[PDB]
Design a protein around this ligand. Structure first.
Ligand SMILES: Nc1nc2c(ncn2[C@@H]2O[C@H](COP(=O)(O)OP(=O)(O)OP(=O)(O)O)[C@@H](O)[C@H]2O)c(=O)[nH]1
Ligand SMILES: [Mg+2]
Lengths: 74, 96, 232, 293, 88, 159, 92, 54
RNA sequence: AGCCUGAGAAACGGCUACUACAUCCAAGGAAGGGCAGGCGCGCAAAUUACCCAAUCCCGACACGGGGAGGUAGUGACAAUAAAUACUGAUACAGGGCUCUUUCGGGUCUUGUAAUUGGAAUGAGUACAAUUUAAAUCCCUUAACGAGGAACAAUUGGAGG
């Protein structure tokens, strides 16, 4: 038989802009940002990422380009 | 100003209340009167939606403006004892 | 009402007896040269725990000092005062050690029956009778006529009669009760008069260490004859 | 130099806007209102306050209650009933407010509603939060946690660092006398009220005693007719006009003054009586409550 | 010290009033200055509703304000308004 | 600066710390130890001060397990790294021993009280596990992986 | 429930026996010092009305519990040798 | 061992002794990185030098 | 300014007269002088807490009395530690990312407001027991206690 105070007034949120759960937990943000920045790393240079698979050599799985040199010219 | 960081003042007249474009600097500016000197200076309210909040003859606290009318030095930080950003965000009600 | 640290460091209190420490009451022994009865019971012997417990034990006739029942809590018992407790039937005696701290010794009745007290002085009392002042503030009327100052007396403790005496002698073994070399049992080898105040004795140990202590601090225990059971 | 910076910042905190005071040398009793949700015991706090002040065990204290608290100034208490009409009237007229909070139950819409109405019309002289029903706790951990979070939410409501007192038990049906004694210690030594422009431009009063003047012949001729009314109280704001004043009895309507009879106080205030000692006398601890018992 | 100067001008004016009518009883203090604040007063009002007089409860307090000449006129009030933050 | 930013992020990700506050804390203690080693190298060889203090410092670092037992020289004490301290942290040690599937799984395990170090359980993951204490890191006796009750959601599923 | 006793002293002049009790409850909550007196009464062949206990800190990690109990030769001895607060905690 | 000597309980450390050990750790040059203590390189090292020369 | 007790005081404890104040009254008269708290602008922020429980002190005296002593409460001024989630499976889409050099290069597994499955639980709620003068805290500890619309992470900056 009493008027309960609702959650907005119980914590005066107001008009703050909306954020994400990745932003709400500061560890997860630095997990998701790191995995994304690890993904970008494989797109510029290359990572070893294991040797030949257990199945054996199945060809250079993504293309061979002839006119491309990638050595650091001393 | 003076030797202090935040000076108090009275809102004398919201000059440029009848500007057309909403975020014009002449729209945002507010003429106030610093109490410690009895002086007349001009300060910026950070948004027109908060120029709606500032009322005439109110103890208005103002500070420096560090970064359309280049040279206005002061900006309004508090109104009647309440933080102005909180007023605009609708956190507290302005005590009059 | 001094602090525990400002209390004398040779009747020991650990780091948990509180910031305070009892002061001894007025009695025979001096203030600096005293061990109070509550500290003897509950801090050294630990036959009780609390001030109220020691109050109850001392209130019933259960602790006897020098043959007489002692009631109050902080009766001073400084040096070589026998403490007979009958419910354990033990007798404790207070000596020092080489470092200079109170050491308690357990004794039975045969050696507990007598005391060994140093003579403070001798005069003639009222009526023309010679009387004898110990360091225990005990006065013996009608003494042996050979017992001068700085003698030592074996005392009956039941009739207070002068049972025996030991003479101040070069070539005798002693115990020190003061000075920077306090508590170093050794033999007196030399006496230096220095007439005009503060005569000195030169006292070496049984093991070749010489040092200078003053006669007032010197306390004769016996030539060889350690009449009290020193701890082994 | 940093001492000069601190001194300048303190003076720039000290300044204000120069508003008109308009307070007379014989000051009217300052208004202490008691506002809370229903069933929190604002009537009981009124009983125990008036008992600490004038030693009278009021069985049913109603209406305004005037008490002298110093040799210079005097207060009067009004409990607000549980209707928002009385809440808005007393809110716009109040000077110091005791905002009751029901403890374990937390905040209530009545409290937040009154706080916002108060801050919108005019922030009064002093506001204090009082927090009750603290005997209704089983673990003191929960007790102090509720106290801390309620103090924080209340601070964010009105301002940083407001006074929030705690009243534990209900001993004699009255309150803990020590608790209300320190409360009265806070609300005894007082400062001049905040000079709001509405109270300092309009003349207002709170009706201490109300009487019906009607000829019983007129009563017999028409049971529903225009009756004349005697309202006795304290003129508080600016000065009334000499004649032809318009009034608006809050919750009735606009009327005109037929007669003003000026008359001396029933709480005479020893400064005004003798018109440099500290204590108050049992000659001097009065009470004026013409509607209560 | 512009603040203290303005407050001292306000106090000079608040002294000049009551110093300019601390001079005569009936003409000034009763007729000119009205009935000053703080003093106790009995008010006789004529024409109050009998429904009020019957339903008068002692709990609900009675507040009397002064209606001024501007407060007695009807017209179109143009206001700046805003909904409350917590209103649904 | 981008170099310090990407470096701190690499450390955080490969050892999933919470924040660069924790990173700077490890950097601070690493800098203090490295400074002490620098002063000891400022002293000359066969001086008793350097001899005893450097032997003490190397023995502390070995007995907490950062410096390898092979190299025991002050040049390698200079070459000590925050990557080595973070490899000695407890959370990465759970992940490397293989009680967890991932480093964040190790973090949440250590938070909700499943692993123990020796005899008492350990609630904090920034614990610096000594080399003598490394081998005794297992599930606690009150954890549903170690024994005890079948647990909360298993209880609600069994009901 | 399982009991160990170290440092047991007769205290003859206070007429009381002081021992440090290492009681261990495995898999149970704490020991209920009333029940501890009830056990120690027959564990040292005396009356429950002449035993008391205090101290009683529970060790870290559960299991061990270190308490200090006292057995007096007579209930009257307990009455005139106990402090009032321990007497009230006992209930006499 | 003191607690078991005369089996009296001890009050868990008070504000005075706690603030004293707090000001000592604030003024000292020690740090506890792991299980072992690290010390600053001043008067301790100087004592090593003095003792070795002596 | 003078005096009084007492082992110990020129006690400020008392008195005596003068001076300077202040209170009660039936106007004849009578007694009395310190510290702590709040404001010190009109706008501000650490308790008017509990017990002598232990150490210690004073008494006719085991029992009476202690303004030292401890116990408690507040704190984002700092400082210390670290929650707000962990891990699978399936289906579907083919692009994701990058650059010096830009209508131009490089690299290859990436996502989804998709669909379901797992486990773990500590904040909190809390029977008790313990702690202690009495309580709290600490240690024990039965029973509860996670699906986002929640057990509800913020503050600033840039940009569509
Ligand atoms: N235990 C406990 N009871 C309380 C407390 N405060 C109020 N009460 C009880 O709750 C009742 C509240 O009554 P009031 O305070 O008079 O309510 P009111 O608003 O003042 O007056 P009403 O209009 O009649 O409600 C009192 O009668 C008390 O018996 C409290 O702090 N603790
Ligand atoms: Mg009421």
């Amino acid at each position: 038989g009493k008027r309960q105070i609702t959650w907005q007034i119980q914590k005066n949120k107001g008009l703050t802009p909306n954020r994400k759960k990745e932003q709400r937990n500061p560890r997860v943000k630095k997990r998701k940002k790191y995995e994304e920045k690890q993904k970008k790393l494989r797109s510029v240079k290359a990572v070893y990422k294991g040797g030949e698979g257990p199945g054996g050599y199945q060809g250079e799985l993504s293309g061979i380009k002839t006119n491309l040199v990638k050595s650091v010219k001393l | 100003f003076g030797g202090s960081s935040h000076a108090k003042g009275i809102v004398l007249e919201k000059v440029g209340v009848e500007a057309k474009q909403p975020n014009s600097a002449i729209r945002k500016c507010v003429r106030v009167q610093l109490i410690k000197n009895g002086k007349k200076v001009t300060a910026f309210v950070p948004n027109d939606g908060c120029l709606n909040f500032v009322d005439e003859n109110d103890e208005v606290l103002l500070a420096g403006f560090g970064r359309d009318i280049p040279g206005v030095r002061f900006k309004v930080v508090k109104v009647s004892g309440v933080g102005l950003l909180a007023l605009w965000k609708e956190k507290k009600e302005k005590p009059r | 009402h001094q602090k525990r640290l400002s209390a004398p460091s040779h009747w020991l209190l650990d780091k948990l007896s509180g910031a305070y420490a009892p002061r001894p009451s007025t009695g025979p022994h001096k203030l600096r040269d005293c061990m109070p009865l509550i500290v003897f019971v509950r801090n050294r012997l630990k036959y009780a725990l609390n001030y109220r417990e020691t109050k109850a034990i001392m209130m019933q006739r259960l602790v006897k000092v020098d043959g007489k029942v002692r009631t109050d809590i902080t009766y001073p018992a400084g040096f070589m005062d026998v403490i007979t407790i009958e419910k354990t039937g033990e007798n404790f005696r207070l000596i020092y050690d080489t470092k200079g701290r109170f050491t308690v010794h357990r004794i039975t009745d045969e050696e507990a029956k007598y005391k060994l007290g140093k003579v403070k002085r001798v005069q003639l009392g009222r009526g023309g009778v010679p009387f004898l002042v110990t360091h225990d503030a005990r006065t013996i009327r009608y003494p042996d006529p050979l017992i001068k100052v700085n003698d030592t007396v074996k005392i009956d403790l039941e009739t207070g009669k002068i049972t025996d005496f030991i003479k101040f002698d070069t070539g005798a073994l002693a115990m020190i009760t003061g000075g920077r070399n306090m508590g170093r049992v050794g033999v007196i080898t030399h006496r230096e008069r220095h007439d005009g105040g503060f005569g000195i004795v030169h006292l070496k140990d049984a093991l070749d260490n010489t040092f200078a202590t003053r006669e007032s601090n010197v306390f004769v225990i016996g030539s060889e004859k350690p009449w009290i059971s020193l701890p082994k | 130099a940093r001492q000069a910076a601190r001194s300048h910042d303190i003076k720039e905190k000290r300044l204000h806007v120069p508003l008109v005071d308009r307070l007379p040398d014989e000051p009217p009793p300052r208004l202490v209102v008691i506002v809370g949700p229903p069933g929190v015991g604002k009537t009981t706090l009124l009983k125990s306050l008036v008992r600490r002040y004038t030693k009278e065990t009021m069985s049913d204290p109603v209406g305004p209650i005037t008490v002298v608290t110093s040799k210079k100034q005097r207060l009067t208490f009004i409990e607000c009933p549980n209707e928002l009409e009385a809440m808005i009237d007393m809110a716009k007229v109040a000077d110091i407010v005791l905002l009751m909070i029901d403890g374990n139950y937390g905040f209530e819409m009545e409290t937040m509603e009154f706080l916002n109405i108060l801050a919108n019309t005019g922030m009064p002289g002093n506001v204090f939060g009082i927090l009750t029903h603290l005997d209704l706790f089983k673990k003191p951990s929960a007790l102090k946690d509720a106290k801390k979070r309620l103090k924080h939410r209340l601070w964010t409501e009105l301002y940083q660092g407001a006074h929030l007192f705690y009243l534990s038990g209900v001993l004699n049906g009255r309150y803990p006398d020590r608790e209300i004694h320190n409360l009265s210690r806070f609300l005894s030594v007082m400062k001049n009220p905040r000079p709001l422009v509405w109270r300092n431009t309009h003349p207002y009063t709170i009706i201490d005693n109300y009487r019906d003047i009607t000829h019983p012949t007129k009563i017999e001729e028409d049971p529903l007719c225009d009756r004349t009314i005697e309202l006795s109280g304290y003129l508080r704001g600016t000065n009334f006009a000499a004649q032809g004043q318009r009034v608006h009895i809050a919750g009735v309507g606009d009327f005109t003054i037929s007669k003003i009879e000026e008359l001396p106080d029933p709480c005479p205030t020893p400064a005004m009586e003798k018109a440099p000692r500290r204590r108050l006398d049992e000659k001097d601890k009065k009470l004026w409550a013409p509607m209560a018992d | 010290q512009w603040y203290e100067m303005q407050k001292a001008m306000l106090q000079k004016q608040l002294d000049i009033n009551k110093a300019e009518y601390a001079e005569l009883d009936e003409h000034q203090r009763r007729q000119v200055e009205g009935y000053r604040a703080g003093k106790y007063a009995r008010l006789v009002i004529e024409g109050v509703p009998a429904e009020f007089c019957k339903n008068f409860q002692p709990r609900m307090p009675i507040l009397v304000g002064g209606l001024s000449a501007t407060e007695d006129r009807f017209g179109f009030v143009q206001v700046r308004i805003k909904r409350h933050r917590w209103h649904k | 600066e981008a170099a310090r930013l990407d470096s701190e992020l690499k450390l955080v990700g490969e050892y999933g710390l919470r924040n660069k506050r924790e990173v700077w804390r490890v950097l601070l203690t690493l800098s203090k130890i490295r400074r002490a080693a620098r002063i000891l190298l400022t002293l000359d060889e066969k001086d008793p001060k350097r001899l005893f203090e450097g032997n003490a410092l190397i023995r502390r670092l070995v007995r907490i397990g950062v410096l390898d037992e092979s190299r025991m020289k002050l040049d390698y004490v200079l070459a000590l790294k925050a990557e080595d301290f973070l490899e000695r942290r407890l959370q990465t040690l759970v992940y490397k021993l293989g009680l967890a599937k991932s480093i964040h799984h190790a973090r949440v395990l250590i938070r909700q009280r499943h692993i123990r170090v020796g005899k008492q359980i350990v609630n904090v993951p920034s614990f610096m596990v000594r080399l003598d204490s490394q081998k005794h890191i297992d599930f606690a006796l009150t954890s549903p992986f170690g024994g005890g009750r079948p647990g909360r959601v298993r209880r609600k599923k069994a009901k | 429930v399982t009991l160990r006793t170290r440092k047991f002293i007769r205290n003859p002049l206070l007429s009381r026996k002081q021992m440090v009790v290492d009681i261990l409850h495995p898999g149970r909550p704490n020991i209920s010092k009333d029940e501890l007196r009830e056990k120690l009464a027959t564990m040292y062949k005396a009356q429950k009305d002449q035993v008391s206990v205090f101290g009683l800190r529970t060790q870290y990690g559960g299991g061990k519990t270190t308490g200090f109990a006292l057995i007096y030769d007579s209930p009257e001895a307990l009455k005139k040798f106990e402090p009032r607060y321990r007497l009230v905690r006992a209930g006499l | 061992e003191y607690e078991e000597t005369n089996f009296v309980r001890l009050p868990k450390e008070s504000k005075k002794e706690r603030a004293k050990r707090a000001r000592m750790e604030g003024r000292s040059g020690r740090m506890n990185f792991g299980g072992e203590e690290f010390r600053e390189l001043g008067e301790g090292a100087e004592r090593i030098s003095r003792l070795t020369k002596a």
